[PDB]
Design a binder for these strands. Sequence first.
RNA 1: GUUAGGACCCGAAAGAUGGUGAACUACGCUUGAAUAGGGUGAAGCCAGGGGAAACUCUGGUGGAAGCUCGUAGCGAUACUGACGUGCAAAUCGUUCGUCAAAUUUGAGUGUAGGGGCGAAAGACUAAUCGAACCAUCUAGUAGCUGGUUCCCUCCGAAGUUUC
RNA 2: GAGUAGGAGGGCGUGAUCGUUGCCUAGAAGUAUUGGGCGUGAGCCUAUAUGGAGCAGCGAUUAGUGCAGAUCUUGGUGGUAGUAGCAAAUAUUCAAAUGAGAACUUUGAAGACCGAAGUGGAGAAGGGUUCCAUGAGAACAGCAAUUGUUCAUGGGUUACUCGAUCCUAAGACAUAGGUUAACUCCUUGCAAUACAAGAAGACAUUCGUUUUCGUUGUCAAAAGGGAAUGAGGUUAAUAUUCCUCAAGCUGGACGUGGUAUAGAGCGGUAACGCAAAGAAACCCGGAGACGUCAGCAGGUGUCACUGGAAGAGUUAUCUUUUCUUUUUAACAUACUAUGGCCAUGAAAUUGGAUUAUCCAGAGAUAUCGGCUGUAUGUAUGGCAGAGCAGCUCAGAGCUGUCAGUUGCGCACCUGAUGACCCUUGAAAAUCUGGGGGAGACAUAAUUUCACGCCAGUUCGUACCCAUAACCGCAUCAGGUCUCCAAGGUUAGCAGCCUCUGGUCCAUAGAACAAUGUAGAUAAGGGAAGUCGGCAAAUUGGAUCCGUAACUUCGGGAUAAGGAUUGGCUCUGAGGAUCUCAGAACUGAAGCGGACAAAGGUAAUCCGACUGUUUAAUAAAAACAAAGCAUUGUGACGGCCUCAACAGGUGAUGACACAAUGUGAUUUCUGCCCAGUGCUCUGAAUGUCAAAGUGACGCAAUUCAACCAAGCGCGGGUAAACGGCGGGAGUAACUAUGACUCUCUUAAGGUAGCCAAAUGCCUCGUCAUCUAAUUAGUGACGCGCAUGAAUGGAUUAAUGAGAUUACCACUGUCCCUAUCUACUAUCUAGCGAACCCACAGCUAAGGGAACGGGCUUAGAAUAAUCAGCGGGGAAAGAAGACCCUGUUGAGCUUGACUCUAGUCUAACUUUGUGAAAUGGCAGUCAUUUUGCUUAUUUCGUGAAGAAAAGACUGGUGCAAACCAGUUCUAAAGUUAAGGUCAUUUAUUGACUGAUUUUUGCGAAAGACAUGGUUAGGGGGGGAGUUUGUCUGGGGCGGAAUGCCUGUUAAACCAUAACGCAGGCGUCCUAAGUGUAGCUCAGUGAGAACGGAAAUCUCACGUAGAACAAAAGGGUAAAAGCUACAUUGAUUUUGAUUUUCAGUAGGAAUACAAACCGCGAAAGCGUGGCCUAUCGAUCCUUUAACUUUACAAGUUUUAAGCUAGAGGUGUCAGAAAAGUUACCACAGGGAUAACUGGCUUGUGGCAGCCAAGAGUUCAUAUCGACGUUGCUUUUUGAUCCUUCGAUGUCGGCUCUUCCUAUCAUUGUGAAGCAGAAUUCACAACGUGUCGGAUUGUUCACCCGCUAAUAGGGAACGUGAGCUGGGUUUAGACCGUCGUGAGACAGGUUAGUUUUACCCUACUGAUGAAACGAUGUUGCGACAGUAAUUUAAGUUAGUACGAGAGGAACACUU
Length: 257
Amino acid sequence: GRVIRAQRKGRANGVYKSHKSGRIAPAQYRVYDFAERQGYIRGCIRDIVHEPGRGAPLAEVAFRDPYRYKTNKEHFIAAEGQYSGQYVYCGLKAQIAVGNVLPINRIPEGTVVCNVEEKVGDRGTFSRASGCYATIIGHSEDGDKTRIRLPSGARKTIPGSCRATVGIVAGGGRTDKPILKAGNQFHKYARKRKSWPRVRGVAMNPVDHPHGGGNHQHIGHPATVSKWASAGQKVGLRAARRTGLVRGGQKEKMAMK
RNA sequence: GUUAGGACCCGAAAGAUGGUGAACUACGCUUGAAUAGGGUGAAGCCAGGGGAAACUCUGGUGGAAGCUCGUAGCGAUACUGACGUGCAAAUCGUUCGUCAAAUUUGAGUGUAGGGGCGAAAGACUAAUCGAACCAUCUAGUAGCUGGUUCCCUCCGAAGUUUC
RNA sequence: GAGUAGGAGGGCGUGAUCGUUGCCUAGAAGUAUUGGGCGUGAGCCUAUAUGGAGCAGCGAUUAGUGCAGAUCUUGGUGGUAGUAGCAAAUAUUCAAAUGAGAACUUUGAAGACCGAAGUGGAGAAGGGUUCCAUGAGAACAGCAAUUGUUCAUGGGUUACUCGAUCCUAAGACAUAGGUUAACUCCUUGCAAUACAAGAAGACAUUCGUUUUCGUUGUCAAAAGGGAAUGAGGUUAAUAUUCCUCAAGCUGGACGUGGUAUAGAGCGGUAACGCAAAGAAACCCGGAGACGUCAGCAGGUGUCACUGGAAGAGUUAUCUUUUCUUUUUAACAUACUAUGGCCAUGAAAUUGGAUUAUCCAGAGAUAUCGGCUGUAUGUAUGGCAGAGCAGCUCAGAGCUGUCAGUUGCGCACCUGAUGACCCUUGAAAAUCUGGGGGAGACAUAAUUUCACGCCAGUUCGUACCCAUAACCGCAUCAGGUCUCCAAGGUUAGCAGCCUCUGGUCCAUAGAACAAUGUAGAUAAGGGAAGUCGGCAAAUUGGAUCCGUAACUUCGGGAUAAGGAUUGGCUCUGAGGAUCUCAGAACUGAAGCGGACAAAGGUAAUCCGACUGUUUAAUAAAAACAAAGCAUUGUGACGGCCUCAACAGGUGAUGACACAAUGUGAUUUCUGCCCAGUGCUCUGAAUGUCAAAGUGACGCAAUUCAACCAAGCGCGGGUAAACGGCGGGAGUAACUAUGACUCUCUUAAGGUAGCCAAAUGCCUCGUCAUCUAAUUAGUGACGCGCAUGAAUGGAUUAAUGAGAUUACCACUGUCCCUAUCUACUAUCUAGCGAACCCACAGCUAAGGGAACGGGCUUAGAAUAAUCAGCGGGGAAAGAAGACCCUGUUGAGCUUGACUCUAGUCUAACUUUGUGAAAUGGCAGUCAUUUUGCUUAUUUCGUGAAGAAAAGACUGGUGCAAACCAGUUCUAAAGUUAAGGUCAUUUAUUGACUGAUUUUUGCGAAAGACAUGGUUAGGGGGGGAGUUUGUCUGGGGCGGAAUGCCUGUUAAACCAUAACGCAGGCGUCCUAAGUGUAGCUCAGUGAGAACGGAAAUCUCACGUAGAACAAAAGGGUAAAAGCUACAUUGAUUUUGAUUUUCAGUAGGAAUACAAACCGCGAAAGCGUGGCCUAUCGAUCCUUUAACUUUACAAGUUUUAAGCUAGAGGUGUCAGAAAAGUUACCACAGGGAUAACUGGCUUGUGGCAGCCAAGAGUUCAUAUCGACGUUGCUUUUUGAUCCUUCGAUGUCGGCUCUUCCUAUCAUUGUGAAGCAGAAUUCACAACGUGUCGGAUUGUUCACCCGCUAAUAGGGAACGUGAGCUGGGUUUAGACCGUCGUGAGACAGGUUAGUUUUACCCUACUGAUGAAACGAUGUUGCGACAGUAAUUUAAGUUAGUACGAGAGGAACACUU
Ligand SMILES: [Mg+2]
Ligand SMILES: [Mg+2]
Ligand SMILES: [Mg+2]
Ligand SMILES: [Mg+2]
Ligand SMILES: [Mg+2]
Ligand SMILES: [Mg+2]
Ligand SMILES: [Mg+2]
Ligand SMILES: [Mg+2]
Ligand SMILES: [Mg+2]
Ligand SMILES: [Mg+2]
Ligand SMILES: [Mg+2]
Ligand SMILES: [Mg+2]
Ligand SMILES: [Mg+2]
Ligand SMILES: [Mg+2]
Ligand SMILES: [Mg+2]
Ligand SMILES: [Mg+2]
Ligand SMILES: [Mg+2]
Ligand SMILES: [Mg+2]
Ligand SMILES: [Mg+2]
Ligand SMILES: [Mg+2]
Ligand SMILES: [Mg+2]
Ligand SMILES: [Mg+2]
Ligand SMILES: [Mg+2]
Ligand SMILES: [Mg+2]
Ligand SMILES: [Mg+2]
Ligand SMILES: [Mg+2]
Ligand SMILES: [Mg+2]
Ligand SMILES: [Mg+2]
Ligand SMILES: [Mg+2]
Ligand SMILES: [Mg+2]
Ligand SMILES: [Mg+2]
Ligand SMILES: [Mg+2]
Ligand SMILES: [Mg+2]
Ligand SMILES: [Mg+2]
Ligand SMILES: [Mg+2]
Ligand SMILES: [Mg+2]
Ligand SMILES: [Mg+2]
Ligand SMILES: [Mg+2]
Ligand SMILES: [Mg+2]
Ligand SMILES: [Mg+2]
Ligand SMILES: [Mg+2]
Ligand SMILES: [Mg+2]
Ligand SMILES: [Mg+2]
Ligand SMILES: [Mg+2]
Ligand SMILES: [Mg+2]
Ligand SMILES: [Mg+2]
Ligand SMILES: [Mg+2]
Ligand SMILES: [Mg+2]
Ligand SMILES: [Mg+2]
Ligand SMILES: [Mg+2]
Ligand SMILES: [Mg+2]
Ligand SMILES: [Mg+2]
Ligand SMILES: [Mg+2]
Ligand SMILES: [Mg+2]
Ligand SMILES: [Mg+2]
Ligand SMILES: [Mg+2]
Ligand SMILES: [Mg+2]
Ligand SMILES: [Mg+2]
Ligand SMILES: [Mg+2]
Ligand SMILES: [Mg+2]
Ligand SMILES: [Mg+2]
Ligand SMILES: [Mg+2]
Ligand SMILES: [Mg+2]
Ligand SMILES: [Mg+2]
Ligand SMILES: [Mg+2]
Ligand SMILES: [Mg+2]
Ligand SMILES: [Mg+2]
Ligand SMILES: [Mg+2]
Ligand SMILES: [Mg+2]
Ligand SMILES: [Mg+2]
Ligand SMILES: [Mg+2]
Ligand SMILES: [Mg+2]
Ligand SMILES: [Mg+2]
Ligand SMILES: [Mg+2]
Ligand SMILES: [Mg+2]
Ligand SMILES: [Mg+2]
Ligand SMILES: [Mg+2]
Ligand SMILES: [Mg+2]
Ligand SMILES: [Mg+2]
Ligand SMILES: [Mg+2]
Ligand SMILES: [Mg+2]
Ligand SMILES: [Mg+2]
Ligand SMILES: [Mg+2]
Ligand SMILES: [Mg+2]
Ligand SMILES: [Mg+2]
Ligand SMILES: [Mg+2]
Ligand SMILES: [Mg+2]
Ligand SMILES: [Mg+2]
Ligand SMILES: [Mg+2]
Ligand SMILES: [Mg+2]
Ligand SMILES: [Mg+2]
Ligand SMILES: [Mg+2]
Ligand SMILES: [Mg+2]
Ligand SMILES: [Mg+2]
Ligand SMILES: [Mg+2]
Ligand SMILES: [Mg+2]
Ligand SMILES: [Mg+2]
Ligand SMILES: [Mg+2]
Ligand SMILES: [Mg+2]
Ligand SMILES: [Mg+2]
Ligand SMILES: [Mg+2]
Ligand SMILES: [Mg+2]
C-alpha cells in the first residue's frame, strides 16, 4: 500500500521541491504605468544574462521611474537579436521593432510575438520558452479581440489591449541537439525540480506502483487510465483518445479534412 | 458442578491508541575540502609540396573526451583462502572494479511510519524493515505444547451413540 | 484385598485468629547427627552438639498451607580443566643504577623499525581533567612491573589584533491574519493569506516642541564573508594571550603646528601627479564577490652546487676529505614586477606576437617617449643588542656569523592566458568612490595633513584526536574530516634504502613429531586433475622492428609477433651571458639483474557505452541511461499535497510541465477494435435518486408522471491490456505441408529467427572439432511452447557477465619430496566456553521395527600423554519442507463489506431592472435580456479610474486627428518662471502641475464557489472471508442429505473413496370407487398379407403389466377396458422406523367430521410396499369479539393457530486468490531421507517337458503351465524420528557378500587343435587410464589375466568438495485478468563446533610370591605376496587345410 512517485510530487516538504537558489527574478513586464497605457517608456539593456533554470536568456532592463529619482531595474524575456545597451520601448505609442512591447491590437496580422498576456497586465503569460513564438492571426474591428496562434498550435482569443513583445524568444534550437551522455541530463535537471533518472513502473514491485507486475514484467491491465482515476490509480497514458503511432493511413489526416 | 470474569500457571504470529528517532543509511539543498606519474592526441593554429583560389597531401603545434594504464580515495570479483567460543555480531591475506566524474567527502539544512526515501535490490530509514522504535489497551485469545506440590484405605472407567 | 483417567472415607505437616493447658538466660526457635526409639505412611518424640530469644499442646476459626520436574523465577555451585588457549602489525641484546623482587623501570652501549601517503609535528568532531608534579598498599594495566591513561594529594587553561560574538545561505521561527472541539496546523525576504506597526535630525534636549524620510521581525556558518601583530624569551604544566622589544586597528577628545575660502587647493597637452585643498538630503558605483580543467611566466619555502671561517667524523692505506652551523618577523620609506592606459605617428612587398591562442586604420609596429596597477622582490630601517656556532675565566668574557651559482626539481602563492557547459559557477555585514550643491559662517564657519592625550568589555584557550584519551560493552587487527613535508633510485607523492622526529608495545624460554596457517622449489609428461585450468604458472618496463579480421572509420592497438638492455674508453649533435645519436674494448651470452611490471588466439550468448544495485551469501543478462514512441494539459488548466483554512509544481507557460512504455547506432514495426480498457462537439430514448409536481385522503401514507450523471446504443483507438485457432473438404500413404470452405462477437503468425540463457520427445538429424565429445560451432526446422517498442533481426567499441576450442604455461595430475616462520609439543605465569538424566567394549536376540543399559554369549586390571574423526542416530535453534489450526501478515483481483479525492442533481448561500408568456384576485409560474452591491479571480511601493476641459505646434471648415520622450548603452531629485503681499528674504499667499466623482485598478457576477442531502464512480485505501471427508495434501470423487439388492455370516445391529444401482422429479389420474375382462407366450386355421398388421380356436401359474432403481407384492386383480367421482379434503392427539428414545422425513392405527363410488358389505387422510425431502428471525397468506396500557372513532401497526417463500456443507455462517518476502501454535495423529513389514514390479533360480538342436527332449536351451528365492529396482504401508538422524554425486579408506570377471584344481560338451560354452571346490589375490554428462546409469576411445555384481544408515559432509537439488536477484518460454506459477530451460548465490566419553593409532606406566640387570621361552593376536610375459618346448602334438597347445628347464 505504498505511495507512488506520481503522488510524491505534490508534497511541498518533499524531495521534489524546485531548486531555486539560482533564480534571478521572475521574468515579467513593466508594472502597467500610465506611461505604458497612454504613451511610451524607454529603457536600456544593461545586460542579457543566463538564469540557471532557463533556456531563454533574460534581459536586464534599466527604466527611469516616472514618479521619482530612483532608477528601476527589471528583467524581461530575451527577444532574439536584442543587444546589450539597446533601447527598448514599452507602451501604447511605442513603435514596432524587435523587442519592443505593444498591445497586440497594434501589431499587424502575421507578426511574430513573445510573452503575450492572457488578462491585461499579466506582465506576460504565453510563449515564454526559448525559441518559442506566438502568431498573430486576426483583429476584431472593435479592437478588443485578437486571435493568437500559440506554440502548441491552438488558437486563442485575447483582449487586444494585451502586452506583447515583438519578435521571437531567444536561444531557440537547443531542443534539437541530441544529448548523448547521461551526465548531461543530470546536470541539466540539477537546476530544476528533480525528474531524473526515471525508473520504469514495471521495474518496481506491486507495492511501489500499479504497473510493476511481477514474474514477467508487464502491465497486465489496460494502461489507458480514465480521467477520474484516483490519486494512486492514475498511471499509464491518462484519458488517452488514441494510442498507437500513425503510420500507413496518414492520408486520413487529409481525407478526414 | 454450569457460567462470567486475568479465572490452575506460563506461552503467539497479530491488532489499536499516543508518542520518539534521518548521529547509521536513502534522496534534495546551502557552504567547505580532495583525486601520484604515464598512454593517447581530437577541434583550433603554423609551414612545406600541388594548386589561380576552394581544397589537397606530408611534418609540426595544440590539448578535447561521462577515453585509457595505475597510486591515494571510493569500492567489492575470486581463493568458494584465513578466522568461523574471531582482532571483528562482517574482520584479515592475496586478488580485483574505478580512479578528473552520474567522482569522493565534512558540516549545516529539507523529508517520519502505511510515512519517508529508492539508477528499483521490496533496498534503506541508529546491529531493528514485505511496515521503525517507545509506552499503553494487555496478564491480548489460544479447540494447541509444557508444568500442576503430603500419607493411607477403599470403588473404579472410556477411545462407542447422536448432533 | 489388582488398578491408569477418575471419585469417595480417614489421616500427616505448615502459618495466623478466638479459646484452653503449658515451656523458656537453670537456655526458646533454628541447625548437624554412625545416639535411642515411635508410627504401613505422610511424619513424631527423645539424646548430644551448636545456638542465644522466643516457644509449644489441645478445641475451633481462617489460608498466599506441602514441589523433582514447567528449555519454570532469582541466587549459589560443580565436571569439563590447570584444559582451549595467551601465535597479525618483522626485534631485540649488554652493563650499570633503583628496589624484597627487574626479559617488561631509568641512564649508557649495540642492533632494527615507522622512512616525511610516518610509528613525526598540529587541528575539527567526539572525550572532559585523562594534562603537570610528588607519592603509592590493594584492585585494574588478560605474563610481569619498582611502571602507568590506574589510586592519593596538590597545581595548571591570562589575548584590542586567534575564534566565538557581527553578516548573510540552504533554511527556520515569531508577530499579524486564518483553521481546529481543542491540541495542533497554514502563511511570511522576491518578506506575508499581514499592514494605522518604522527610522533620523535638530533645537527641546524630557516631555514637549519641531522637522525630515518612511509600510511591517527575528534565528540559522568555531571550513563561507569578516577592522588591526609580529619576532625573541620564559613554565614542572599556558602562551600570535604572560615578559622584553618592535607594530598596527577601531571608537573617544582636545592640544600644537600646517592645508585650503571673501567662495572653496596647485602641476601635466594627455593619460595622471602631490603630507592636507567647504557641506546635507537624494541617486548611482567599486571592493567584498566566487566554476572545472590545461599549459606558460614569476615569487616564497625546500632541495643542489661554489670560495671563506669555526666545530665534528675518518686517517694502517687513500681522501686540499665527509658531515654541521653560516638566520632575519610583522611593520616604515624608496625603487623594480607578466597587464592596462597617454601622447607622437600611421602599417600592403601587411605587420606584431605566444609554448598555445590572438591583435591592428574601431590606428598595429615604432620612438633619448610618458602614465598607471599587483611582492610571499631589492635596499635601509627593525637588526644585533636578538638567534645560531665555536672558545675562555671563576655569574662575567671573547671570536665568527661572510661572498657567490644553477635547476622543465618539488610544495604553495601570484601574474597573463587558453579550453569547457540544454551546468555557466551565493548573499549580507563591512571599507570606500562618484553625480548633486539644499544649508552653515567674520573673529567666523567647514575640511579624508602631520605630532601628542584616552580606552578596547563577555566567552573559548589544559590535554588526547587514536593498533590505549572518540564510536565500536574493552587498552577491540574495524570505523572516524583536515595542514605541514627531506636524500638515493625512478616516469613517479610507487616500491625498496636512508636523514630529521619517533619507536622496539604486542607474555616469555626450550624442543622441532604428526596435522595445520603463511612462504617457496621439484627431474620426465603437460590438464591426463577437476563440475570447471579453481589455484598456481606464463607475461610484464623502455628503445627499435613488425602488426590481421572486423568497424559506427573514431577504433581494433602493448593486436599478433621479433629483437635490444651491464660495464668501460672515446666521438659527434641540440643550448646560455639537461636531452639525442655514433664507434671500440670487456665478462660463464649476463645486464627492466632487487624493486616495479599485460599471458595470447579464434568463436557463441547477453547488455549498447561511463554509471547503479541486494550494509552482512546474488555485481548480473537486473536498474540507469542516450536514442524511439505514445498520453495528458493554453491557466476558468494539468499532475499531485491536504482534518480544516488551504497548498506545491510556479521566480513556471508547449524548445514548457505532468503520465507511461521501449531501451545506443543500423534495419524492420505485418494482420486483428469482437473482448477488456480508454476515448468522442454521434443518436436517442431503452434504464435511473433525492427535491419538486399531480391524483386519493381533514391526514400518516400510498399510487402515478416527469427526471442529471452513470449504464446500455453508435463511432474512434493496438509504439492501449491483449489476440495471431479448431473443424471439414480439395490436391487425397499419413504427417508437416499448398488452396479452399467453415465455426467462435475480432484477425488466423506477415517480415524475420532457432533444438537459442526460450523443443517435451532429446544425448533431435547432418556436418565440423577429438583417439574417443549428453560439451562448442554451422546447418536443417511435422517450432510441446520463436516472432515483431508485451518489440523482431542485426551490431563496432565494450565486461571482476554466461560457454567451446586452441597457443604459451605450469606441482591441477601422474606422485608425491624437501626448506623457512608461527602453531600444535614441554615449561614459568595467566586461564575461559560449548555441553552434561545416568553413563560410556562389543555379537546376536527381542523391543517404539539400528541398545549403552534388557536375554544369552564374547569377556574384563591402576593411573597417564600425543593423536584422531567410526559411534554417542554429538552440539547448535520448541523444523525454515509437509499437514493441522474455524491463527496471522505482505501482495492481487472480475471475493464479500465498506472508504478519501472525484462526476451529477436538489435546496441553500440569493440581490435587483426590464421585457415576453401563462395563470390568480398588485401577485405568482415559465422564457428572454440586462444591472451590481453580495460572491469569486488577478493585480498595484492601492497615483492618472470614470467623465469633462486646457497651453504650444501641426494637420486641419466645425469635427477629429497627430506631435511637444526614437540615430546616439549619458543627464534629468531638494526646481525655474509668472501673479499678489509682506518683507527686501529661495519670507508669506496663489499659480506654475484644469474640473467634478460617498468605487485603488482590472476580470468574472448572482454564474461560479461554500454548506447539507441524492445517484453514480472508486483495490488508491480499510476490514474480512476464501467448508468437510480424504490410505499426506492437491487434482479427481462424494462413502456430504436420502432408497433397493449384496458384503452381513437364518431376529435386530454391524466397517471401508467395498459390489450393482437409484433419488431432488413425475401423476386431475398414473388418486379414489364400481363393473366387466385376462395378460406374456405357444400350436393349428382365414383375400391383398410377405418375418411382422388384423380375424379363430385350443393351450397358456403369471413367464405380461403395474411413471420412475432394486427387491418384495398382485389373476373373477394391484393387470386390461369402461364409467363416476375429488378422501391429493375438516379437526386434533397417538404409534412405528433412525433415536439423546430431541427434531425432522416418511408410513400406520384410532376418535370425531364432510363426502365419492357401489345393490350392498365394503373401500377411499393420495400413488401397490420400501426413496422423492427443510428450524430460529423475517415476509406473505388463511381463519379469530387478542392488544396499542388517560378515553374513544378511524387509518395504520402489533399478535395467537396454520400453510408457502430456505438453507443440497441438506440439525440449516452472508464469503476469491497469491506468497520462493513470509509468520505463529502444534503435529511424527501426516508427506519428502534411512530403517521395519510386504515383493506385486525388478532381479536370480528351479519342476513338467511341446519343441529347437540336420539324426536325437534334457551337450546347450525350453513353449504352454507351474514351485521358489532375493531386497543393489520400482510400488505399497505409515511403525520410529517434525524442542531437526544434514536430504545427489564424486574424491578418500576399510571391511563384508558370492548370484566367481580373472587367477588355482577339477567334472561336462554338438570338447580334433585353438577358441568357447555348462557345472563343482573356491575370493586366497586382483579387477585399471580418458572423451561427453553434476551425475547413479549410459555411450564411446584404450590397455589388460580380467576390465565380475553387491553390502556396510541407497558405507563414508564437526573428512573434503558443492557441479546437481531446493530460499532471497534475474532472463526466456507456457499458464493466470492479476499477485504469481511450472512437476520446463537460463545465470549469480554461506558448507559452523571436538579440548568430553568411547573407538582406533601410537606413547609412558604403579603394584603380589625380596630387589635389580642380562640371556631366553611363547600362550595368544596379525600376517603377504598375487599375476603376467619372454626363451625353450615348436610350426611340435591335433588337423584335409586354415590354424595351433601344454608339463619340465631358463630369464
Ligand atoms: Mg514547513
Ligand atoms: Mg532530440
Ligand atoms: Mg497496486
Ligand atoms: Mg521469481
Ligand atoms: Mg522486457
Ligand atoms: Mg514489458
Ligand atoms: Mg463455586
Ligand atoms: Mg472458573
Ligand atoms: Mg506487539
Ligand atoms: Mg502511530
Ligand atoms: Mg545527516
Ligand atoms: Mg583500499
Ligand atoms: Mg593462496
Ligand atoms: Mg577484503
Ligand atoms: Mg482442534
Ligand atoms: Mg502468611
Ligand atoms: Mg550459662
Ligand atoms: Mg502433634
Ligand atoms: Mg553452651
Ligand atoms: Mg487445627
Ligand atoms: Mg519450597
Ligand atoms: Mg527445586
Ligand atoms: Mg563452570
Ligand atoms: Mg589464536
Ligand atoms: Mg605503534
Ligand atoms: Mg598524530
Ligand atoms: Mg602531538
Ligand atoms: Mg532565507
Ligand atoms: Mg518559510
Ligand atoms: Mg580579521
Ligand atoms: Mg601584545
Ligand atoms: Mg585615531
Ligand atoms: Mg573564471
Ligand atoms: Mg662550503
Ligand atoms: Mg610595462
Ligand atoms: Mg652577538
Ligand atoms: Mg615553475
Ligand atoms: Mg594539495
Ligand atoms: Mg561568469
Ligand atoms: Mg563630488
Ligand atoms: Mg582500534
Ligand atoms: Mg616461543
Ligand atoms: Mg615438473
Ligand atoms: Mg607443451
Ligand atoms: Mg618441460
Ligand atoms: Mg586464476
Ligand atoms: Mg592506430
Ligand atoms: Mg609487443
Ligand atoms: Mg583482438
Ligand atoms: Mg653495450
Ligand atoms: Mg651506441
Ligand atoms: Mg658483448
Ligand atoms: Mg630478466
Ligand atoms: Mg585465458
Ligand atoms: Mg553493462
Ligand atoms: Mg544510489
Ligand atoms: Mg554499495
Ligand atoms: Mg504532446
Ligand atoms: Mg507502449
Ligand atoms: Mg505491431
Ligand atoms: Mg424521484
Ligand atoms: Mg482463413
Ligand atoms: Mg545444444
Ligand atoms: Mg572438453
Ligand atoms: Mg553435439
Ligand atoms: Mg569477456
Ligand atoms: Mg624441557
Ligand atoms: Mg604452562
Ligand atoms: Mg531386530
Ligand atoms: Mg550391541
Ligand atoms: Mg550381561
Ligand atoms: Mg563422531
Ligand atoms: Mg560436545
Ligand atoms: Mg489474507
Ligand atoms: Mg457519495
Ligand atoms: Mg485488500
Ligand atoms: Mg453407493
Ligand atoms: Mg448406526
Ligand atoms: Mg449416482
Ligand atoms: Mg374389480
Ligand atoms: Mg441415518
Ligand atoms: Mg372411514
Ligand atoms: Mg418452511
Ligand atoms: Mg517376478
Ligand atoms: Mg517360462
Ligand atoms: Mg517414511
Ligand atoms: Mg543434530
Ligand atoms: Mg550424525
Ligand atoms: Mg558358488
Ligand atoms: Mg542355466
Ligand atoms: Mg575423470
Ligand atoms: Mg548416502
Ligand atoms: Mg532463485
Ligand atoms: Mg498473458
Ligand atoms: Mg525453475
Ligand atoms: Mg568441547
Ligand atoms: Mg590403546
Ligand atoms: Mg627373584
Ligand atoms: Mg626382571
Ligand atoms: Mg626381557
Ligand atoms: Mg595364527
Ligand atoms: Mg611360453
